[PDB]
Symmetry: C7
Subunit: 262 residues, 7 copies
């Protein structure tokens, strides 16, 4: 029969809903304004969206604390419950947040760009795109790999395609009776007739190891990154043909045998 307290309670509830509505409006407005202010200062779009989302959820948290205080919930209760909900959402989004930060770093510092062959922790292939949470790459034989950004940032990032020039390394092994000067002279002529091998870099042709069955010569020559494999195959076929023409042997595995007829 006494509606006056009921009127006060309904009025407090309507005031709580009005505070919620106005708080969502002001949160969206201040967050969009901070986002435009950051984009105008050339902050990265993902960092801008992240900081704007944090500002919007903070203003919404103040609005919730105010409205729930209007309905009689204490500030300590609302802070504890919003903290538990935030800890749950943070447990769900912890790894995704790590991948988001790693993706921002990969887009900012550019350890690798799309189209560059790389080697991210033992997998290797052409990069296709860095994305919000993971990087796609196509391996040499066409398989697609999707590496999460945090694993990429946490480890080494070998990059085959960054330097214009790269070095071949042949390991020719010839018979122990082969002349050393003739081998070095033939390998030197083979790498001096190769126009794609850079003459201003190193061009080693040195005996390198006395192996179990052969003396292993090493040849190290530099070439542009686009000519590396073709130079390898061409120098290899030329080595084979010229050694076969010159009489130098490539040994089969060797074994002395001390015969004992028991």
């Amino acid at each position: 029969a006494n509606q006056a307290l009921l009127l006060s309670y309904a009025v407090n509830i309507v005031a709580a809903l009005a505070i919620i509505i106005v708080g969502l409006i002001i949160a969206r407005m201040i967050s969009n304004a901070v986002n435009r202010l950051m984009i105008s200062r050339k902050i990265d779009a993902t960092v801008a969206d992240f900081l704007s989302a944090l500002v919007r959820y903070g203003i919404i948290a103040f609005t919730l604390i105010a409205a729930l205080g209007r309905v009689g919930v204490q500030t300590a209760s609302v802070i504890a419950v919003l903290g538990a909900a935030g800890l749950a959402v943070g447990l769900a989004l912890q790894g995704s947040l790590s991948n988001l930060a790693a993706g921002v770093l990969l887009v900012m510092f550019r350890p690798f760009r799309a189209g560059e062959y790389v080697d991210l922790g033992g997998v290797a292939g052409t990069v296709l795109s860095v994305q919000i949470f993971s990087t796609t790459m196509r391996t040499a034989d066409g398989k697609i790999i999707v590496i999460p950004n945090g694993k990429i940032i946490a480890g080494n990032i070998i990059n085959f395609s960054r330097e214009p020039v790269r070095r071949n390394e042949f390991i020719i092994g010839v018979a122990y009776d082969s002349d050393i000067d003739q081998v070095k002279q033939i390998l030197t002529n083979i790498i001096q007739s190769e126009d794609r091998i850079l003459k201003d870099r190193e061009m080693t042709v040195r005996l390198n190891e006395l192996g179990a069955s052969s003396i292993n010569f090493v040849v190290r020559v530099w070439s542009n990154s686009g000519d590396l494999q073709n130079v390898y195959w061409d120098v290899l076929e030329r080595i084979k043909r010229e050694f076969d023409a010159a009489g130098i042997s490539f040994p089969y595995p060797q074994m002395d045998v001390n015969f004992k007829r028991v």
Copy 2:
């Protein structure tokens, strides 16, 4: 004999039960409304159920704090005890929550879809379905594997079936005395007569290594993902037959032996 205090205590208990009932009702209603509001905005059904469950448990926590305050328990006591119960439930559900978030990410970004052959951390097989906590896959020989979603998201996701085309790589090894031009010409004719090998891609036929007993030619040819294995087996049998017809040898392992009758 003095029932007035007893009446006040029974009235406070009934008011606490009434606050509990009304609080559960309002919690269920606001949670269903937030869930419908999120589903209408095309949020994922699992993220919608998660955020709605958080809203419902938060409103129930406010209701518990209010009723337990009506029975005389202090707000600090109720917050501490609900925080301990929430920390226990969170210790129980930590890994399941990680798998739930990883499953939401796998369904959203689609690193792999059902029916695509993959390789999730060293296990490989056709995917069957991504589920709330774990992914099922059937390996090539019919074993079922159940990989938890967090392990899948944390590591690499090789995907054999995403790209339409993929590359074969034969490694033929022939005797050192074999002619190189004849080997390359026979392998080239074999891969040029193969209609399932894409002629617009690479078709390498290059000497690749001077091995212990053989010179290892490499052949790399591209084909549609569905023709890859049949092209491998057909080119392999054709290589065998044509080399046997042409007189080119596949060496047995070689060994020079220096006889010494001691």
Copy 3:
């Protein structure tokens, strides 16, 4: 001589004991009621016992805070001491709680059931039972293994017995001079006369590799999970007998030897 303060102190102590007794009674009653309410809603019995134990310990914590406030201990002291005791009990029960949650998940989602051969992280054997903290399994030779549930849930769960059908894979290796058509025809007749090999699945008989001493044919045939091993042994003995009858050889390891009498 002034017993009035002594009377007030003894009365406060008796009131604290009465609050403790009534609080234990109400805790047991509300916990049993919540447990019956959950079991009636078809919640899992272990989750029901867990949530009921949490409700009972929470009501006991409120009762302790009330009684210890009656004896003059402050609410902050009781909350801090109960929090330290709860942190100690939680450090003791952390791993057991992880195993309990993993066991609930294994009983709910059924990645494997009792009597199904599995492979949980490198150990393999018939499952015997999933239990509250660990799973028992009997390996193929009769050893018992007890894997804690958390280790099982955290890793892959290969399941040999789930699919009705599974694939055999023979790897026959014959001499390089062997006819390929005759080998493929004999293997095809051997797998076509085998009634336990499913004719509606794949039945590959393809040359697969040119090995060091032999050409390795592959045979892949599907059969029901109960016939897999018997089909393997029967096809193997039939391959051996028919190749010996047809004159096809299984090579011994090969080695060319270039004799050099030095």
Copy 4:
């Protein structure tokens, strides 16, 4: 000269010491009563001692907070300092507490008992006793191993001695020219004359693999855990003697050699 404040200070100090003494007495009494109440309910003695120690230290903490409040230290100061001392003691006792809980679990669920051969994470030997913090075991050759209980509970617990029966697995390898029916018949007679091999279990004698130099027969037979090794050695010597009597050969490693006098 004004001793009245000095009298009040000395009286407060004596009251603090009296509160400390009475609090230690009541703590010891309530802890012993809770310990007897738990032991009477058949709780494990270690869990009883743990919960009683927690009750005793909690009552001592309330007594310290009361006395230090009597000397003028605030409740927040005493709670913070006791919390720091408890965090230090907990950092010191964290691993010992994990081992204590794991030892309680090992004594309760009995994955292994004393005198049973086991394999706890790659070490194997007869168990000697489970103790409060670590398990002792004597390996087959007499070395003692002391494995902490937490490492045991965290990993697999293979148990060689639990099942009454266990399976032998011989892998006989005979020459390719050996008759298969004669080999299977001799192995079958050898395992049928062995009274310690259980005839109601499996008794496989199947050709299993066509190896590099031999066809590997497999023999799997079950026997009681106490007869396993003696049955292995006896069947092995009988296999050797009967194959030597029957003319079946055990091949030496084989190698074809294609002689080439260059």
Copy 5:
């Protein structure tokens, strides 16, 4: 000109210094008294020093909070700053505290004592002393190893010197044509003439494996820990001499060779 407030400030500062001095005195006295009280109850000296240091730093913390309150710093400020300093000191001393607790456990339970050969996680050598933070051991060839106590407690502790008796295991391999009864009889006589081999234990002499080139007999005999190596060397030389006298052969690695003059 108004020195009265200056007098009050100087008096408060002198009172703060007096509280600091008296608090350090009372802290040292109560800590020494608790230390003597623990040593009198046969607590370990390191645990006694640890708990006494905690009591002394706690009383000093109360004294600091009181004096800094006298100079006007609030209790919350002093608690926060002392908590930050304690968290920094704890980050510095975390590992040293873990090693201290592990050293107390190693001195209490004695998994190993000084002079006993052990194997702590893959390093092995005579123990020299357990110390406050690390254990010293001298390996068999005289290198000193210093293993931190926490690494020792966390892993297995194999102990070669605890059991009085230990088992040798010879693995003799003889030619396939060797008589089995003669080999077993010679090995049995060799281990029956050895007085240092315990006749009340096992003395197996069983054929154990049919190897690639030899049948591997096993001999397992027990002896006192001090006679183990001398018994090994003596039985080994006796096996060699008696087999050479009896005509039994130790095979060289075997290889059939199928000659093919191509």
Copy 6:
């Protein structure tokens, strides 16, 4: 109609905006002043920027707490929400902060400088630059590697280029019948005629191992870091030529063969 409360609310909002503006101004000024004060004291530029950023964000946090208190938000709400936003930003920047600190340490202590060959955790190459978050290095063959600074600081940092002098180690293996004095004399003359080998260091020429087919001499000689590889190749070719001239043999792998015509 009653605008007086509306005037008070608009005035409080304008005062909050004015406090925000003045607080940002004072934050930027005090942060720039602290930054100049640190740079003037020769603090590292990165540590200066870090501490100045912390001072600026702290002053901005005080300004936010003041303005949000002016609009009616409580201090506890603002502290909790700013703490949640700071915990989120810290979860995003945790790894980047670890790399920043590691980069400051690498620039301060200089374990390696640019242009020095190193080996950071199994990858090796010339360092190019240490940067804010990762170190770039060019391997010997031209690949670029980008190692995050925290991984570098956490592990070993081998440094090939720091010491002026470094040691070669040849391992010559000659036939068992070779004279030892003649081998040692020839190797000694070869390393005494080499002017780039430091005569004031060690120059060992000792028989080191009796191998399976050869006695392995060791030669260890020191040389300047720039002459190391050229000295290796020159001494190797001189060893080969002088041994071939002196008649000393480099054995092929050896094998006695006990012929048995069965």
Copy 7:
């Protein structure tokens, strides 16, 4: 126009700056006094600098809380912001603090000193100096290694140079037909004529293993740490010369061959 409030605000600001200045002065003075008091008590210089830095930053924190309270910032705000700045600085300095504590432990307990050969976790070389954050060592061939102190303290610390004496272990392998008494007598005379081998230690010369092609004698002899390698090389050359003079053979790898002309 009303400057009185403006005068009060400017006066409060000047009082805050005066409190800041006086607080920095008193912080520096008390920190230097505590540092001198610790150095006078022979505390380590690094622990003294650490505790003095903690005292100085604590007094500065009290001064900041007082001044910021004078400008109107609440104590809770200042404590929260200083706690966030301290948590950020602690996240940056966590690893450096671990290395600092480990370096203090290495300088105090001296597991190794400069100039002693060691083996810290698989890297080995002469120690050069222990430093504030990392230890430098020069490997045997002149590479410099920089191991962070925490990695050193966390693992084993083998120390080759601590014990005055160390043991050589030769493993001579002679032909099966060689006399055992003659081999043992020659090895005994060789190690008895070696004056640098300690005659008061063990001098084993025992047959140790019957290998695939040779009986492996073991020789274990002790010598001073400075004579170890020279004794090894001298005993090795003497073994070689005396066995060649006595007619004892070092076998080449052996192989029986059962000829079969098929």
